[PDB]
Amino acid sequence: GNGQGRDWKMAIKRCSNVAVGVGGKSKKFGEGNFRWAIRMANVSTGREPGDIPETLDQLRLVICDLQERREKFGSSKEIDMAIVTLKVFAVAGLLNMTVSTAAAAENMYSQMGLDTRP
Numbered sequence: 806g807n808g809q810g811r812d813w814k815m816a817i818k819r820c821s822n823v824a825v826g827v828g829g830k831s832k833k834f835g836e837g838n839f840r841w842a843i844r845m846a847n848v849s850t851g852r853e854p855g856d857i858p859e860t861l862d863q864l865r866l867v868i869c870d871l872q873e874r875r876e877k878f879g880s881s882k883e884i885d886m887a888i889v890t891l892k893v894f895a896v897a898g899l900l901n902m903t904v905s906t907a908a909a910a911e912n913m914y915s916q917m918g919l920d921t922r923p
C-alpha cells in the first residue's frame with residue numbers, strides 16, 4: 806500500500822482476462838483471486854505470509870514446491886487451484902502472455918520443462 810509497479814498492475818489487469826474455468830466465458834481470475842492463491846500456497850509451503858516476489862524463477866519455484874508436497878499427500882482442488890493461479894500469472898505476467906485459460910498456462914509451464922510432470 807505504498808509503491809506500485811508496471812508488471813504488477815499489468816499482470817492483474819491481464820489476469821482478469823484469464824479463464825480459470827477454462828472455456829472462455831466467465832470464471833476468470835482477478836486481484837482477490839490471485840491473492841487467495843499466493844496467500845494459501847505461501848502458507849502451505851511453510852513460508853511467511855509476506856511472500857510477494859517478482860521473478861519468473863520465484864514463481865516456478867513455488868509451484869515445484871507446492872506440487873511436491875501436494876504430490877506425496879495426494880491431490881487437492883484447493884491447493885491445485887492456487888498452483889495454476891501462480892502459473893498463469895507468471896507467464897501472463899513476466900512473459901506478458903495472454904493466457905486464455907489457467908489450464909493452458911500450466912500446460913505450457915510443464916510442457917517447457919518448468920513444472921514437474923504434466
Ligand SMILES: *C(=O)CCCCCCCCCCCCC
Pocket residue numbers: 806807808813843857858859860864891894
Ligand atoms: C500495498 O498495497 C502492498 C501490496 C502491494 C505489493 C506489490 C506487488 C509485489 C510483487 C508481487 C508479484 C507476485 C509474484 C508471484
